[PDB]
C-alpha cells in the first residue's frame with residue numbers, strides 16, 4: 001500500500017496585492033497540506049510549513065493512474081492523514097476568537113480529475129515546463145480562503161438639517177460589531193453555506209425580524225465580533241445564504257455608540273425619552289447604524305466585483321463599506337426600517353489574493 005511510482009508538484013494561484021489601508025489583508029499560506037485522491041482513497045499527502053509563505057509544493061509521492069484529484073487544505077488546524085475524501089469534504093470550520101487575529105483562516109482548493117503518469121508530474125506549472133506529465137499548464141491551483149471579510153473603509157457623519165438641532169454622533173467613540181453572523185460553514189463545496197442554523201453576534205440587541213430565534217436557531221455572543229471603530233477595522237466571517245429559510249438572515253456590520261445632543265453631551269430628559277420612543281436609542285442613549293452586507297436594497301451602492309447585492313456572503317471576498325450617517329440610528333438593528341435608515345452606503349467588493357513573492 002505504501003509503494004509509490006510518481007511525484008506531483010503544483011503551483012498555487014497568486015496575484016499582486018494592492019490592499020493598503022485595511023486591517024483585513026490578503027492571504028499568505030504558512031501551512032499547507034496537499035493530498036492526492038483516487039476516488040475515496042488518499043494516495044499521497046505532504047504538509048509544508050513556511051512562515052515566509054507557500055506558493056508551490058514539489059515532489060509529493062503518489063501513485064500513477066487515471067482520474068486522480070489534488071485536494072489542498074491550508075492555514076488549518078486539522079489532522080488529515082489517512083482520511084477518506086468523504087471525511088475531508090465533510091470537515092467544517094467555525095468562527096473563533098483566533099480568526100480575528102487572522103489565525104486558522106482556512107483555505108482550500110481541489111483540482112479537476114487528471115492522469116498521473118509514472119515519474120514527475122506537474123500541475124499548474126507554466127506552459128512548456130519540463131515534465132513527465134504537465135497538466136493544467138498556465139492555470140495554477142486556486143487555493144482560497146473560506147472566510148470573507150466585512151469592514152468599514154470609513155464612517156462620516158453629516159447630520160441632516162432636520163436633526164442638526166437635536167443629535168450628534170462621534171464615530172471615534174464608537175464600537176463596531178457583526179450581527180447575524182453564521183457560526184460555521186463547510187470548507188469544500190460549490191457553496192460553503194452549512195444547514196446548521198447557528199449564528200453569532202458581537203453585541204446583544206433587541207430581537208427583530210432578522211434575529212435567529214425561530215425554532216432550531218441558536219444565537220450566541222462571540223466577543224471577538226466586537227471591536228472599537230477605526231478606519232479599516234472589521235471582521236472575518238463565514239458564508240451565509242440570507243434567504244435559505246422562511247425569514248431573512250442577513251449578515252450585518254454595525255457601528256454603535258452614544259446618540260448625543262447638538263453640543264456632544266448626553267441626552268437628558270425629555271429629549272432622551274423622545275429619542276428612545278422614536279426607536280433611535282436605548283435608555284443609555286446607545287444608537288446603532290447597521291449595514292446589511294451584500295444586501296440588494298436599502299439604496300446601497302456596490303462596486304468592485306459586483307454592482308448589485310447578492311443577498312449572501314461569499315468566501316474570499318472583502319466587503320469594504322463606506323458609511324455616511326445623516327440622522328439618528330436605531331435601537332433595534334436586527335429589524336428592517338419601516339421606511340429608510342438615516343444612512344447611505346457605498347461598498348467595494350474585492351476578492352483577496354494570495355500574495356505573490
Ligand code: NA
Pocket residue numbers: 208209211213214
Ligand atoms: Na423572530
